[PDB]
């Protein structure tokens, strides 16, 4: 039998950064498809993009600073190659914003690394990103906070985007995710991101959902889910999860925002991809 963790959403974590999930949400009218590289996993249990199993690998980086450039390796310290992916596994996939990551070392006693993922120098795909002043040495890095992109000019934080990993061109990204249509809309898991703003980071799946699927590699056109309140046990709303690894629901007019987060998604059964959902 197929299963989704029997755990409240409020006790789970975002998949594009190590942040507790504060709510569920929907994308703006100018957001059709999404192409997040992290937090990507099929129900089959297959991981895609730079998505890792453990949240300990999310939005992190490993590499040796050259003084002018940083040559990337996997979190492991093992070589990373272009043919492998848009960038090393776990690498930050947040677009539309500058990055500020905490750099630490194994054997030395932290340094802030300000990242503008926009210049020619930002080429994670070829395992190289500018060392914006980071001294020579090896490092471990975690996204600590973000800020507005420093170049589209006057531009604001846009966490629906994915950073420009290349250009070299074919960075081998994970396919885009599109709403199935029919009034159905993609559901996102929101987490509050530190920074000089009210940034809300969206992700298709909580991190522990990804580790549950990769483990419980269960062999369904679409999964009919019930958002259930643990205590009362009442069904708070119908939802659907698709093979490719995302959830959808039909907002009851101008949806999931109006729902509490201390609930749980329970699998009911396998239904037709064209199964008309009851408005949420």
Curated annotation (Swiss-Prot):
Region P1 sub-domain 1, annotated ranges: 1-49
Region (Protruding domain): 1-280
Region (P1 sub-domain 2): 174-280
Region (P2 sub-domain): 50-173
Function as written in the Swiss-Prot or TrEMBL entry: The soluble capsid protein may play a role in viral immunoevasion.
Stated name of the protein: Soluble capsid protein
Organism of derivation: Norovirus (strain Human/NoV/United States/Norwalk/1968/GI)
